[PDB]
Amino acid sequence: PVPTGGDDPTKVAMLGLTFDDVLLLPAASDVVPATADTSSQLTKRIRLRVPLVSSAMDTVTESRMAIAMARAGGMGVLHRNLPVAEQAGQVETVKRSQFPLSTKDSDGRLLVGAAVGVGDDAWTRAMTLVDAGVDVLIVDTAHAHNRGVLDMVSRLKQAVGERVDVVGGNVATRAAAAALVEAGADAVKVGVGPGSICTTRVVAGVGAPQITAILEAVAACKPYGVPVIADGGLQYSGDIAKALAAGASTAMLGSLLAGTAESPGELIFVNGKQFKSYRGMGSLGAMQLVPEGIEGRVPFRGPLGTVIHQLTGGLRAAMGYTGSATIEQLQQAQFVQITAAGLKESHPHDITMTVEAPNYYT
Amino acid sequence: PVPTGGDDPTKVAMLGLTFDDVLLLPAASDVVPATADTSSQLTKRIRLRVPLVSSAMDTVTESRMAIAMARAGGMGVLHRNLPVAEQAGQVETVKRSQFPLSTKDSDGRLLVGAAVGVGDDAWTRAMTLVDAGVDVLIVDTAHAHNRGVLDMVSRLKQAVGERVDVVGGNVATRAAAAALVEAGADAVKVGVGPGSICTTRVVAGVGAPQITAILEAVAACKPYGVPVIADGGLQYSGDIAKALAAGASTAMLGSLLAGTAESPGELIFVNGKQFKSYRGMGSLGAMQLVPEGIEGRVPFRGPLGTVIHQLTGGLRAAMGYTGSATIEQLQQAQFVQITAAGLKESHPHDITMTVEAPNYYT
Amino acid sequence: EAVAACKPYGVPVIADGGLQYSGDIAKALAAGASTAMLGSLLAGTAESPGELIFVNGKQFKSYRGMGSLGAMQ
Amino acid sequence: EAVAACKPYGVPVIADGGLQYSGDIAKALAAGASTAMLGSLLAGTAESPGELIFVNGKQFKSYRGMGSLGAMQ
Ligand SMILES: NC(=O)c1ccc[n+]([C@@H]2O[C@H](COP(=O)([O-])OP(=O)(O)OC[C@H]3O[C@@H](n4cnc5c(N)ncnc54)[C@H](O)[C@@H]3O)[C@@H](O)[C@H]2O)c1
Ligand SMILES: *c1nc2c(ncn2[C@@H]2O[C@H](COP(=O)(O)O)[C@@H](O)[C@H]2O)c(=O)[nH]1
Ligand SMILES: *c1nc2c(ncn2[C@@H]2O[C@H](COP(=O)(O)O)[C@@H](O)[C@H]2O)c(=O)[nH]1
Ligand SMILES: *c1nc2c(ncn2[C@@H]2O[C@H](COP(=O)(O)O)[C@@H](O)[C@H]2O)c(=O)[nH]1
Ligand SMILES: *c1nc2c(ncn2[C@@H]2O[C@H](COP(=O)(O)O)[C@@H](O)[C@H]2O)c(=O)[nH]1
Ligand SMILES: [K+]
Ligand SMILES: [K+]
After folding, report:
1. Cα atoms found within 13 Å of the Cα of residue B238, Cβ hemisphere only
2. Which residues bind NAD(+) (chains A, B) (predicted)?
3. Which residues pair with A267 in a beta bridge?
4. Ligand 4 atom showing the smallest separation from residue C37 Cα
5. Do the Cβ atoms of B94 and B112 come closer than 8 Å?
6. Are the C-beta atoms of B335 and B25 separated by less than 8 Å?
7. To which H or E segment does residue B279 belong?
8. CB within 8 A of B353, min separation 6: which ones?
9. Which of D52, D54, D59 to mutate to probe the C interface, most C CBs <10 Å?
10. CA-based radius of gyration for chain C
11. Do the Cβ atoms of D61 and D54 come closer than 8 Å?
12. Atom 8 in ligand 5: residue holding the nearest Cα
């Protein structure tokens, strides 16, 4: 019999690795961290100076956050939890608005992104957003291997292909990424359940660990040149370095940017400290059922520029350790799989911390 | 495909083991622990009676610590966070100064070592230290597979290779150790991340578990007779025994020696208990940016001699268990891999310890 | 293992014990089981036997195994 | 003193504040008072306004003065 039970060797397909299961192996390096080139292709036509994209969530990205992310070298994606006219107004506000790395189009204006669903109402929203000058559309769905999501992606590529870039929803397998690539998507977003606010892997018991999912999606997408975006489950800059090394071209950040000042919402004072609200788009409050997210609060951090600077410094240090001149070389790095004891050895241990580092906290 | 994902069987190169994942197997023994010989090679020409070295940290080793370590049978390495004239003065102070195991040169003077960086200013500091009477130069870096570190090691060995011994920076792979040996290093230090105060494996996500790294480095250094020093991650004398059995010849100690009276710094009182500062060299305060260390405090221990005696007693017990007359015989002991339950069983369990033992802390 | 022997004869398999979430039910059904039997998930409902218990202002209900000392007496 | 002022004219005196036991009420009535006004002795009953506070397995209720900062705001 099969060692794990039954007579079917393909019942348990594979062992899945996540960010905490692997470490990057140092290699022969001739690269100073300051000279590392952290530019990467977000889509087949858009290249960012910093490969970080803000999450399309109602407590993460709005006009201010989108403008700040575009100025810092990345991009912001406005959420679709607003009326269509309001979303178009936010797109116009971003496009209408020191920062040498800022992302700009052929007209010299900042780049913005918008998220739409699936359906005729979503089609009207997408048409309104495209008419307002949006550059990239995201078909933001929880299960992108559904036939409706693929049909919507094909429709958008057929209609507004010459003017915008269409990014498919979340996938976690090789077959889903291949289907999205065949459907005509310009970029594939990866991750089902690893988000810090998600309960999908608990409520439905469905998902896949992020590192293995990224590897599978890259094996499905790289021959066609389609970029891969790692979405959800990133907590440190080492996580971003690992996600890029596993094959992803861009990383989408949630809770790391929710505690910044540019994020929408009011500051909450609790017990002499500061926080702000963070919740999933599938949470009960956001969808007003069977929710697949939770509501919570993250500690307050400050300006987005400092956070992006620290994350980029960590990524530059990783590139220096691996000897990667560009991201295209960082994607050829190798991993070492570690156990739980190795995981606790990686973090600071046997020490009582008396002052916090800019890039680390418990 | 690969069970962890993708089509490349070499993406996840190996499975790394740390000190907590293995145990030493007992063997036929004719060795009394009190009759074991713990002498081991530091470099190709320097043999220590106690195979322990002190870390080059601004909270661990200064003149007093170097003198105490040399008297106890080991050696000290002065940190390079000091002005060049000040470090040369510390070297002269150590050389200017019951202890049957004390390590001394051919002129009856206590041995000492000093850490240098990479660069032309580092060259000036190294030449000053050599002219001031240092016994070994440690090219102290974080990534020794960089071209600059190898060039610096080659230059030092070409200039003052007949007067001093050159020890290369920290490596974590077989290729890096082979490159350091080819460059002309007298000894190779191993460990990138295991440090109790380090955050390199979190900020950059780069490293390797210590046991696998030591085995890989020994696989490249032993055929050429180059000693290997295990640096970082050691919390018990059993860890020292495991590191020696993996192939290392000496173990450099950090936090284990940072709480003794001979370590630089002042006593601190918190709720009737004694602590003292311990911070990483890549921490924010130490480099005064993207730090790769933290600042904290460790409980006060006392005289260095008692700590060294306890560690050597544990090592002698391990040598007696494995039937190793010498460290060279300990370097051929076998390992058994354990699970998390095995690690829980190795420590005291289902007990409420009421009095602290000299060699174990809960 | 049980489904590997029960499926050829058309005998259904019931997964009993250890289920704490709906994802666990989905995993049990996907492994070959046809139904799931629930314990503590339904022990705190209003329809289960037993009086309510109040601890620190919150509501609880008693739950014990049939092999427990009290239940086997 | 108040009773010395009020008794000849037949005006009753109400003792208000500081009572913690029934003996205190008896002492106040013996001193010349006619009735007693109770504070903390009735602030912990069910009929008193407020919500039960649960701490360390014991029940409390909130009690504050009208001159307190949180009651004058
Ligand atoms: N052993 C470790 O894992 C580790 C990690 C961080 C810091 N440290 C300690 O902190 C101090 C300073 O460390 P440092 O090495 O950054 O000193 P440093 O800034 O003086 O660097 C010296 C040389 O190391 C190499 N180097 C270091 N980090 C590199 C990277 N990320 N990518 C490429 N090359 C790199 C370069 O050749 C550089 O010129 C030392 O005392 C060191 O032991 C150690
Ligand atoms: C699960 N996942 C959810 C929900 N809303 C958004 N998301 C996903 O999480 C990502 C961010 O996760 P972090 O780990 O916090 O960075 C988002 O980009 C989105 O893909 C939800 O309700 N449940
Ligand atoms: C990471 N590692 C660092 C830093 N400064 C020094 N080190 C290394 O750690 C060792 C200490 O190990 P312990 O586990 O504390 O015994 C040192 O000897 C050195 O090699 C730093 O900032 N980050
Ligand atoms: C062990 N198992 C016992 C006992 N009484 C009943 N059971 C089993 O547990 C199931 C419920 O498990 P939950 O995880 O609580 O859902 C029951 O259906 C029964 O099969 C006992 O004393 N010991
Ligand atoms: C002082 N006295 C205050 C305040 N609010 C009310 N009072 C007086 O105290 C009586 C309560 O006495 P207990 O000892 O609690 O029985 C009240 O009846 C009232 O006369 C205040 O803020 N400061
Ligand atoms: K560490
Ligand atoms: K034990």
Report:
1. 15
2. 140-142, 191-193
3. A276
4. 18
5. yes
6. yes
7. strand B273-279
8. B362
9. D54
10. 16
11. no
12. D17
B63-93 burial, b if ≥16 CB within 10 A, otherwise e? bbbbbbbbbbbbbbbbbbebebeebbebbeb
Nearest CA to ligand 2 atom 19: A232
Resolution of the experimental model, in Å, one decimal: 2.4
CB contact A358 to B (< 8 Å): yes
- Provide the sign of the torsion angle of the four alpha carbons A224, A183, A57, A69, taken in this order: positive
State whether residue A201 sits within 8 Å of chain C by CB: yes
CB contact under 8 A, C26 and A206: yes
Q: ∠B44-B46-B48 over CA atoms, to 5°?
A: 125
Mutation site, A2, A201, A202, A289, interface C, largest C CB count within 10 A: A202
Are residues B296 and B220 in contact, defined by beta-carbon separation less than 8 angstroms? no
| Chains within contact range of chain B (3+ C-beta pairs < 8 Å) | A
Angle at alpha carbon of residue A132, lines to A131 and A136, rounded to 5°: 85
DSSP A180: H
Say if CB B221 and CB B177 are below 8 A apart: yes
Contact B6, A19 (CB under 8 A): no
H helix or E strand, kind and range, residue B240: helix B237-246
Report the 10 Å Cβ neighbour count for B120: 7
Check: CB of residue A239 under 8 Å from CB of residue B203.
no
Residue ranges lining ligand 3, Cβ < 6 Å = B 55, 57, 170, 195-198, 200, 231-234, 252-255, 280-283, 292-293
Is D54 an 8 Å CB contact of chain C? yes
List the end-to-end C-alpha distance of chain D, in Å, as a whole number.
Answer: 35
Helices A84-96/A63-72 angle, 10° precision: 40
Provide CB contacts within 8 A for C45, sequence distance 6+: none
Question: What string of DSSP letters covers D20-71?
Answer: -SHHHHHHHHHHT-SEEE-SHHHHTSTTSSS--EEETTEEE-----TTSTTT
Contact yes or no for B336/B23 (Cβ under 8 A)? yes
B79: β partners:
none
| Ligand 1 atom with least separation from CA of B57 | 41
Dihedral angle over CA of A196, A217, A312, B278, nearest 10? 60
Euclidean distance between CA atoms B198 and C27, whole angstroms: 40
Which 3-state string (H, E, C) describes B14-43? EEECCHHHEEECCCCCCCCHHHCECCEECC
| Residues whose CB falls within 8 Å of the CB of residue B151, separated by 6 or more in sequence, listed in order | none
CB distance D33 to ligand 5 below 6 Å: no
Question: Rounded CA gap, A246 and A24, in Å?
Answer: 10
**A314: number of Cβ within 10 Å:** 27
- Helix or strand or coil: residue B207? coil
Q: In a 3-state reduction of DSSP, which class is residue B198?
A: strand
Inter-chain residue contact B6 with A216, CB threshold 8 Å:
yes
**Phi, psi dihedrals of residue B321, rounded to the nearest 5°:** -60, -45
Q: Which residue of A has its CA nearest to C29?
A: A205
Residue A283 exposed, middle or buried by CB count within 10 Å (0-12, 13-18, 19+): buried
CA distances from A120 to A123, A125, A143, A247 (A): 5, 9, 18, 35
